Amino acid sequence: TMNILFTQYKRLKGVLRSQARALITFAGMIPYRMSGDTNARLVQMEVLM
């Protein structure tokens, strides 16, 4: 999902922000340890916008 929305801001470049925010906040509140490299890609792409 985040890779897609990322590509969306990519094409728009080459709301999306607030949506990405909702996703990252979800990741945070989620009572389940997602994998590590998962969190890595999430944080990095959330930044790169």
Binding site: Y32, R33, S35, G36
Partner: protein, 681 residues
Amino acid sequence: SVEESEISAMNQMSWLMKTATIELRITSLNRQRSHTQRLLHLLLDDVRRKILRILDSIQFSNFFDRSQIEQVIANCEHKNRRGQTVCNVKLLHRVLVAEVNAAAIGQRPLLMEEINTILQYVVERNKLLQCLHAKRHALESWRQLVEIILTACPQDLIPTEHRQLIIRDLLQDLHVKILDDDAAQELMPIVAGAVFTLTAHLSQSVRTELGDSSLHMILRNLLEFILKTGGGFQRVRAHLYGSLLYYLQIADVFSKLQRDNLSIFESYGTALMEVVCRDACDGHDIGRMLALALLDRIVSVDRQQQWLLYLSNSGYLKVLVDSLAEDDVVLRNLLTPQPPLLKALYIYESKMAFLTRVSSQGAIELLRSGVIVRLAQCQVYDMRPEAPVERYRQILLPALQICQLILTSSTAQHLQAAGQVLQFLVAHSDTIQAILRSQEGSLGSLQELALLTGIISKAALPGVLNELDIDGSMMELQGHIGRFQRQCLALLNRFGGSDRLRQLSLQDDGVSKKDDMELAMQQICSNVMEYCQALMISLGVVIHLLKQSANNFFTYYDIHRQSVGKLQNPDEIKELCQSETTQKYGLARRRLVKLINSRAKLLSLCSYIIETCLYILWRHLEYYLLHCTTQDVDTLLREGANSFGESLQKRLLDIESLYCKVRSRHSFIQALVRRIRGLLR
């Protein structure tokens, strides 16, 4: 007791202790009894026991902007000589007076009064600390006091029941103290070690006898502590964790306690699970080990798989898989000629341990985690060193044990288990190929060829390589499977021929290791044998196999029955221990039953293997001299009446009559030999 000069009376008693301490050390290091004895009596002669009173006196209970003055009291703070972080009152007075001298004229008295308030503040903070270091050294004392008082005195001086009652009361009071909400945080680690120590003591004590309310309250305490621990003091964590591991190993009366303890540990519910898991994935190295252990233990002790449920649903197992990738980085490190941290080993161990200790529902989940698949990605195991050898072993060994436990507990059709293991082997084609070409009869390379053959046995069944063509890979894979079965066969000619007489010979130019290695060679045969027993589903090999087998069979019936006599009934005791009065007798009992079962396994093994070689020969001869078009069958029937001499038949029937009637309601051997002779005539 100086109500007015607390700090002094404290430090006094502290030094007096330390002196008495070095004294007890020496006085034991040579000898003396009556002074130790009198002090003991006054400590315990019933009137509260003395050491109780001693511990019991030590009371474990205890203009300007706010943040600016707080930073000021924080900058002039200094650790007093006994470690207390006291606020330097005089330097604070100096700084406050200076800044006071630095609308301001009428405000001068307000400034000076607020400075005096900050002064009383810094002074109370100092005195507070001073009290803190005082109580700190005080408890350190009473602690080390007990440490010697129980640690070095020959337990003769104390009736055991007294030791139990007192160590108990000590845990009771110390828990009462560490648990009160007003517990100074820093005072935590101290009682920690105390518990650990006191605990193991009571442990041996009660074990040496061999109020359950007390052990229950104890575990309840130590838990409640481990919970009360913040997520920062990973030290106090590892400590409590080890403490619990012991409080468990202390335990049909055994099954009754086991139940009751499982019930207790449950009553904590998901919380302690969440804690232990958190540390397990995240804690400090000492905590990491001790915890992963505790987890393997709790898992072995719990039937309803609940903790397995939590660990799996909570995603922890995935954290573990990551830990596997990381440990792979660690072995990649140790690949170099200078390992930074030997600990990385002990970690990878405790991890794979908790793994192995994880029945069925688990195994479903674990294979579902693709643990194997991760292992398949690992490149380190391909670094078998061309002690270095002892290391590369210590690495490959637990890995192979893992893959084998997998192929075992994963029901025989989770074909991906096989195919992945086969991928593991194919990756190490050169490596395992060499490990097969191994001629050095070292016990190590022995066990390595052992596990390698056991895997290739359970795996290289053709039934897979046809389900993997879903082609060049199918061909290469079946080729590797074939080479595997080829070596798995050819190992029989090494370990199971007259050449074995060479291997036990060249190394003669120790009682347990013998029965061990005998179990070993027997299992090695058994493995190559079952491998072929499936595979068909020079024959002189199989014949000589039955022969040497029956040979060792009488050898073992004899050795084992002699050991049976030995078990039913100084140098003898020394050798009765050198393989593994009262405890050497226990060790002798142990090694006895050990060798006995090892022998009986060798016996059933030869017996099955005999049924096998017999069946394989029966079918092979049927094919060779009944349906094989032609000189081989003539020589065949001839040599068959030639080698299956009535000597062999009589030896086998005597063996069956010897041991089979104690274990097998069927004279299967007699009917098989009859059919064999019938096919021979």
